[PDB]
């Protein structure tokens, strides 16, 4: 199979800010990898993103009946669907499992990365802080960043550059909407 | 901010269509075009909500028509193959002989067609596995997840083999216990 491929995507985007107080509908049409025409509820009519999409914006804008229904969709489409799935989406809360461990076994007084593993959580919004003997360490923090697992959970590894020495106590502290008080996990060098 | 996206596509000449809802990047559901039914991503969703699948097929029929019109209007400018970035991870810290899941992340590619295979010690693993449909990206490329539950061992090696027109050859992404 050597045929060229041709792709068409349609994306109806309902954007919500501050609850459903502010809603924006953004209907986008994409040919191959390039958006060509869109309806933006803030604008009130179709606009050609590229010249290729101009005939469509013109053809559709001429039909004021369709535009009215698009202008109303912010209510009949977005706000309605928000309310449909709110309980299992906006309000989904899954508490993360938090573990701390050295990246690998290193010799005494050798450098190492202390890993704070934060997994299985939802939503994605999270804060992870490192403490050495009760004092926050902001330097030498490297992370994998926020990782979306595709199954409505996230994970992330936040690592602290350090030279673990006997007696030291390292704490990883996690703030997340699923809990009202921070999760803490200690690791003793 | 939260974002709900109804994302649809049609691809020629494959005649592949897709209809899905996305919430902050996670699939709420898609409609099985062949069986004409609504497939919720997590079982619980279906208990709290519903959606008539028949509407999806009508939409996709419109998308197919628009595609052919657009294809001609662009003078048959074909899509540029963009090969996927592939990553294999566990969904939790790996404990020897402790149930876990391998995730093959297939990301930043187009068109939305790929062949994916899990390999254990070089042998295809075709049971226990699962996958998602194609998920939308803001740059209008696609994401996809494949899953393989397993039991960590010092004896097993794993690969996710991915094939895509953007690639000169099959891509193997390796995972094994230290």
């Amino acid at each position: 199979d050597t045929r060229p491929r041709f792709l068409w995507q349609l994306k109806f985007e309902c954007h919500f800010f501050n609850g459903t107080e502010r809603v924006r509908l953004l209907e986008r049409c994409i040919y191959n990898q390039e958006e060509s025409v869109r309806f933006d509820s803030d604008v009130g009519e179709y606009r050609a993103v590229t010249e290729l999409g101009r005939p469509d914006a013109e053809y559709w804008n001429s039909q004021k009946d369709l535009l009215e229904q698009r202008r109303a969709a912010v209510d009949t489409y977005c706000r309605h669907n928000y309310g449909v799935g709110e309980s299992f989406t906006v309000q989904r809360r899954v508490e993360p499992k938090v573990t701390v461990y050295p990246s690998k076994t290193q010799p005494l007084q050798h450098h190492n990365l202390l890993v704070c593993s934060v997994s299985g959580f939802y939503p994605g919004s999270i804060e992870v802080r490192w403490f050495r003997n009760g004092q926050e360490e902001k330097a030498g923090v490297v992370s994998t960043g926020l990782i979306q697992n595709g199954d409505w959970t996230f994970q992330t590894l936040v690592m602290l550059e350090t030279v673990p020495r006997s007696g030291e106590v390292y704490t990883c502290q996690v703030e997340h909407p699923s809990v009202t008080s921070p999760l803490t996990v200690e690791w003793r060098a | 901010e939260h974002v709900i996206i109804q994302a649809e596509f049609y691809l020629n000449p494959d005649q592949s269509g897709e209809f899905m809802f996305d919430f902050d990047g996670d699939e709420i559901f898609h409609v099985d075009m062949a069986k004409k039914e609504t497939v919720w991503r997590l079982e619980e969703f279906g208990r709290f909500a519903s959606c008539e699948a028949q509407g999806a097929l009508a939409n996709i029929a419109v998308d197919k028509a628009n595609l052919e019109i657009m294809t001609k209007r662009s003078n048959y400018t074909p899509i540029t193959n963009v090969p996927p970035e592939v990553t294999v991870l566990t969904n939790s810290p790996v404990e020897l002989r402790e149930p876990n899941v391998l995730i093959c992340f297939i990301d930043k590619f187009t068109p939305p067609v790929v062949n994916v295979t899990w390999l254990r010690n070089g042998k295809p693993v075709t049971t226990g596995v699962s996958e998602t449909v194609f998920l939308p990206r803001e740059d209008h490329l696609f994401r996809k997840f494949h899953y393989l539950p397993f039991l960590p061992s010092t004896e097993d090696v794993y690969d996710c083999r991915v094939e895509h027109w953007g690639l000169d050859e099959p891509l193997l992404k390796h995972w094994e216990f230290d």
């Binding site: 449909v84 | 999806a56 009508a58 419109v62 628009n66």
Partner: peptide, 14 residues
């Protein structure tokens, strides 16, 4: 439909 997702409908091109 209160508990039913509504689908937006794509416009046809000329």
């Amino acid at each position: 439909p209160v508990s039913k997702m509504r689908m937006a409908t794509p416009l046809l091109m000329q």
